[PDB]
Nucleic acid binder design. Sequence first.
RNA 1: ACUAAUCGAACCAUCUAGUAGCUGGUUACCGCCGAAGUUUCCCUCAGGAUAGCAGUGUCGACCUUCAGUUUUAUGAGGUAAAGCUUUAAAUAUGUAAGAAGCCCUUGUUACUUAACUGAACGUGGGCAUUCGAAUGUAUCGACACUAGUGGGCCAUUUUUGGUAAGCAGAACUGGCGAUGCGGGAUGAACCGAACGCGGGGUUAAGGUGCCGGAGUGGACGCUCACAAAAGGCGUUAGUACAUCUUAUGUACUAGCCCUGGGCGCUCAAGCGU
Lengths: 126, 174, 52, 149
Amino acid sequence: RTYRVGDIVDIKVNGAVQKGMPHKFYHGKTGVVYNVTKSAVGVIVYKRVKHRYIEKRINVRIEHVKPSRSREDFLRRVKENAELKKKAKAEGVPVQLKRQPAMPREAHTVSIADNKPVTLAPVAYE
Amino acid sequence: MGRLQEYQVIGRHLPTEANPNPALYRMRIFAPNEVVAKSRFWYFLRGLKKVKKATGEIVSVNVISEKHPLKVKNFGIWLRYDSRSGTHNMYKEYRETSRVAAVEAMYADMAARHRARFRSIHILKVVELEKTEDVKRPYIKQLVAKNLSFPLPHRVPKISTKKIFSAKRPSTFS
Amino acid sequence: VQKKNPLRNKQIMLRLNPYASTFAKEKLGEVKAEEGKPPKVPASFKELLHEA
Amino acid sequence: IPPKPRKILQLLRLRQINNGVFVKVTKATAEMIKIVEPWVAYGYPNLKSVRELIYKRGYGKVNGQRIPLTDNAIIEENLGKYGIICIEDLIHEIFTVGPNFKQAANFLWPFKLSNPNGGFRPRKFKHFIEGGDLGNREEHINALIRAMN
RNA sequence: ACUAAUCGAACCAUCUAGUAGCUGGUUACCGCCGAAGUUUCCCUCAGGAUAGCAGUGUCGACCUUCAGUUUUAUGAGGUAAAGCUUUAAAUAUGUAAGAAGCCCUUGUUACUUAACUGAACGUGGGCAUUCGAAUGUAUCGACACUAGUGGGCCAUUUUUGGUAAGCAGAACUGGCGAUGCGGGAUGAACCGAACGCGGGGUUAAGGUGCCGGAGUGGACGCUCACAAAAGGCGUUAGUACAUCUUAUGUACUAGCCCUGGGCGCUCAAGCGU
C-alpha cells in the first residue's frame, strides 16, 4: 500500500509486529498524514482532554495504517447531488436533495385473513 | 399493582421484502395503563423469540372487560416468581367477581406471603373454575360449602376520629 | 404592562382570535356525531377478545 | 449530571427544572431524548395542551428578548416570512406539524411551567412503567401539563 | 525538686535596621468577573520556564461560522448466539458531513515512478430563492500586561500487578481544597435542590400517634421478639407421593419469628404491595 502526505489513514495495530507499537490509547484511531518515510508514516491525531482538543504527532509503520473510508459517503453524495440536479434542470422539476432523518411511520391497516393471531403465554421453569 | 385492567396486545415484526405479512402474535397482559401493557408485551416477546421493540410494531391494544362482573366465581391462577433462590411455580385460588380483581388479590397476596414484586411475578394462566370439586383449596372450600352462615362477633363500631372524647363506653354488639 | 390570560379574560381572546365569538355562538364545542344506525360488532372480534 | 446528557439538555433548551419545549419525533431527536430520560418526562400533547400552553404561557424571542404573545402584530414581525400571521396559526403549525415547525418552535421561549397541582407520584425519579414520573408516557402528558400549566 | 559528683566561661559601644531560613501579623464599604494542581522543555537543588484554567483593557471579521449532542457513512474493541474466523449485535469511542467543495481534462517541476503513476502551481463546470442531515446560536478569532495553582485529596468506572487475605498503581468522569438551603432524630457519607430582598401559590427528597406542620386514613395478608441440605409437638401460605363405604399422612418450598431518637407501639405507631 502507498500513502500520500495529507490523506486520511486509520491505524489498526495488529499483534504480528511489535516494533514501535503505539499505545492502547492510539489503537484504532483515525488521523491525517504529514510525513511519509521508508517504513514509518507521520500521523497527526487530535486528543480529548477535559473540554478541548490537543494535537499530537506520531510515526506509525506501514504494517497497520490503512486508507480511510471516512469521506467515501461525501464523494458519493456530491457526485449524486450533481447528476440529479442536471436531471432536475433538464426536466424542469424539483428534487429533494438533502437527507431526511427517517420520520415516524404513517397509518395502515392489517387484515386478519390467512393470519389468525396466535395467543402466547410465558412458560414454566421446567 | 393499582386498578389493573386487562389488555389484548397484538404485534408483529416490522415487515421486510423477505417476510411480508408477518405472524401477528397476541398476548393478554394485566397492566394499570396502556403504556405498561405495551411494555410488558415486548418484554415477554423478546423473552420467547428474537423480536424486539425497535424492530417491532404494535397493531392493537384493546380492553377485555368482564362478561359478568356481577356474578361471584372462583379463579385459579398459575404463577411463576423469581426469588433470591431462583424461580418457582405455584397455583393460588381466589374468590372475586372479575379476573382483574383476582389478579389484584394475587399481587397483594404474593407480596405479603412471599415478598414478590411486579417484575418477578409472571402470569401463566388465569381461568375461571367452572364447577365445584375443581376447587383444590381449603379456605375456599369452607366458603363454597352448603348454607354458609357465620356471626360477626366483636365488630368495632365506627366512631369518628375527630370525636376524641366520648360520654358512653361503646358497645361491640352491632 | 400586564399580560392577561385569554382563557380567563374574554376580551383578550377576541383580540387575538376573532373567530372565538362565533365558535361559542354556534356551539362547535358541542358538535353532535353523525346520525345513522351503527353496525354490530363482528363475531370474529368477540372470539379474539375472549380468547384463551 | 454527566457532561453528555448535560449538552443535550442545553441543546433541547431544557436549562431549568420545570421547563417545557416542543420537539419533533425524529430519529435524530428520539435518540437524543432517550439519553436524557433520567431527567425528563415527555409524551404526546393534544390540541388543548397546545392551545393552553401558547395562550397562557406563550412567550416569543424577539431580538433575544422574551416578549409575551399579547398581540397578533408581534407574530407578523417575526414569523410572517413563513406564512404564520396569528396565534391560531402558531398553534396550527405546532400541533399539525407543518413545513415550518423549526422556525415556529424556536420562536417560542421554553415554557416555564409551574409545579404540578396535586404533586408528582411518591417516587417521581423512576420510569413511568415502574410507577415513577420519568421518560415516555404518551397521552398521559396531557394530565401532567394540566396540573403544571 | 534538693544534695554530692560532672562541663564551661566575661562585659560595653559601633559596623548593624548584618544576613540566612522559618513563624506570627498586615487596617473602610459595596458592585462585577472568577481559578487551580494539568501539557511540553531545561539545568545548581535550593528547582526553573512553559501550556492550561482566570481578570482587566485592546484590535480584526459578522452568528456566515461554531458545538463535551443526536443522526447518516465508515474504523476500532470484547461477550452471548452462531458458521464451518463469518455471522450479527450490546456498551462506551475515533474520522467525515461543500463553495475554505468535487470530479475528470490539459501544460510544467527541484520530488517519485515503466509511465500525471502520483504530489504541488496553473485551466473547465455547476448549484448562491432546500448550499446538499437534526438540534442549538449569549458567534468568534487575536494581542498584550497581571494574577493564584503549578508538586494534592475523595468517590465511581475501567484496567494492571499482587497478598494467606490484604493492598498497590495508573487513566476517565464527578467533586473537594472554595457552598449556603430541605431531609438523613445526629453527621465528613448519601437524597433533593444550588443562593439578591419580600408577598402568594405548588412541590421535590422525606414524612402525616406525641414531641412535630401533616392520616390514630382506606384494601389484603403475616408476626407478639454470626448462619449451616441448623435445630421448632409455634402459625400461615404452596408443591410432590400413598389410603378411602372394597377426610387424611410423609417429605419439602416460601414467608417470618424462638435459639443460632425519646415517649411509646402489637386487629401497630412493625413488614410486603
